[PDB]
Assembly symmetry: D2
Homo-oligomer: 141 residues x 4
């Protein structure tokens, strides 16, 4: 897919280049049922006015990666998956380079999957983490 | 200039090039205890399934709470930056606007905390964000 | 009930005085479907070794009050309610007196209710807050 | 003395009278990067429905993460205390033990952060706690 999001449907409401993810440049590298990775090159579109990666950008990258890692498994079982909680904590800022995210699945329940997502800079330092709780529900249409 | 608080003569990134400008965040009211902001839904704010992106609610809450703290503390020699953002999602938004209201609930020497509500065009509570804002002396 | 917890069943697995809540002295004052209050007199049983109310005590009081405020409504509809996330943030410590909690319902969905709980000292100051997310599920037995 | 780190000659509250002593928390391993603790389930740890109290997992995570920070920073003149505890609950515990393992993931000048896992007697992950620990100069 665009951004390499999992291809689980024949068509999507919004094309990759037009979504938030498309606009800021998020790209998924690996995806398996228990772990997924994605990254993004830092440009001003990712920053706040003070020149640092925007807090919302780490949240969004985590959210898309954990959500979609769940969608990759559950869609074909007739479920929808959507984030119900995103708790991101910020340890070190990023000014430039890339942000690289790794989502590790820690719980796969029938109604909720939980992913721990680490967000690292190009030196490998842990700049933020997000705890992503993803609701899983039967698709209604 | 998204109407962000004018606290400095120069900013490293212009509004229109920032994430906030790209998606269209605009601050309406700002006081030390309460601030509001809003955005029109466009595809730039959406994920590929046509709903407002989880990260969009987080980014709105984050810029609002953070810059409402900057508004007070910058002229006191302090830098303010988000240290935790906990957003929870109750109802999706497909189109219209998202409107945020940040209510300051704690203002301590090193941390300010804001409860942010994110509502749709019908006034319904779609999400909430608990924003924890670190306050530290500006590094010369 | 003991602690004035909502009386929704003819019998309970564990008596009030023997539970955590019983042991530390939590007591519910008001309960309605949208708001509930409870308090606790501070004694050493509530404190950590450094003499301050234990971080776990604020979490527990919030958790019981939001959970039970949900149970008060949903039990008689055949649902069980149990906390799925408790996010407590700590602003000011308490050394002695009481901790008073007020739970305000902010979302009542079919699977999740969400309560904002403020925890105040005897001077009325806001010492901690907890965001309580309560899963609601049909009872299995 | 729940085996908490011995960093001071006197403590305001004895172990047995603290919340930790009343419910039975005991620290096993403690190093600067990783600590473990456990408790036997008894009714004192339970809510009236017979399951381990939500607050019990939070209190375990909180004392473990906090005191693993005290272990390092106290002798450096610093006080450490929890500023946020985010616990999420995946599976209940009716009886047996709860075992916690705190892994330090960030150690900054003013905040240390610990990922705490809470497991049952079968090793299953029952809950997790993200502990944010504020570190400040001790007030003389
Ligand atoms: C919140 C929760 C109900 C959500 O369910 P989930 O994430 O979809 O997880 P699953 O439904 O896949 O099941 C996990 C376990 O939760 C419990 N559970 C789930 N639904 C339940 C229900 N309707 N009634 C009773 N227990 C239930 C069961 O113990 C289940 O184990 P089992 O499948 O061996 O019976 C579940 O995660 C949970 O019970 N969490 C623990 C809550 C807790 O312990 N809070 C602390 C205070 S008691
Ligand atoms: C986390 C914390 C230290 C961060 O400090 P802050 O947000 O900058 O808050 P302030 O520094 O403005 O001070 C608020 C109160 O915190 C306490 N505090 C702050 N710094 C302190 C320090 N270095 N030593 C002792 N107490 C301190 C004091 O009670 C202070 O009140 P006072 O200034 O009237 O004495 C402070 O919010 C706090 O103590 N939170 C509560 C911690 C808690 O109770 N945890 C649960 C287990 S005890
Ligand atoms: C997570 C969630 C599914 C849990 O459901 P809940 O707390 O039990 O709330 P309810 O089920 O009572 O319903 C609230 C709304 O959620 C949505 N929803 C719930 N279940 C759904 C499902 N199976 N399929 C699609 N939408 C659903 C619907 O919009 C619903 O409104 P409606 O009842 O008018 O259709 C729901 O809160 C939600 O969708 N949250 C918003 C998620 C979100 O917007 N994330 C941001 C990125 S898109
Ligand atoms: C929140 C925060 C300031 C708390 O500080 P802390 O936990 O004590 O961390 P430290 O103070 O040990 O410093 C870690 C990095 O934070 C930044 N920082 C800390 N204090 C700072 C200050 N007063 N001014 C500018 N940067 C500061 C520096 O990048 C520091 O790295 P360095 O010491 O190598 O320059 C720090 O963790 C931080 O900056 N977090 C990331 C904030 C973020 O990116 N938010 C998202 C929107 S920009």
């Amino acid at each position: 897919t665009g951004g390499n999001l999992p291809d689980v449907a024949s068509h999507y409401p919004v094309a990759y280049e037009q979504t938030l993810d498309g606009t800021v440049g998020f790209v998924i590298d690996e995806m398996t049922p228990e772990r997924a990775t994605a990254s993004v090159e830092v440009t001003d579109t990712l920053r706040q006015r003070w020149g640092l990666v925007h807090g919302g950008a780490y949240c969004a990258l985590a959210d898309m990666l954990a959500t979609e890692a769940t969608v990759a498994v559950v869609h074909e079982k007739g479920m929808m998956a959507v984030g119900q909680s995103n708790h991101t904590s910020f340890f070190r800022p990023v000014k430039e380079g890339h942000v690289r995210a790794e989502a590790v699945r820690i719980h796969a329940g029938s109604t909720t999957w939980f992913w721990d997502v680490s967000l690292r800079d190009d030196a490998g330092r842990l700049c933020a983490v997000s705890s992503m709780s993803i609701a899983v529900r039967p698709r209604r249409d």
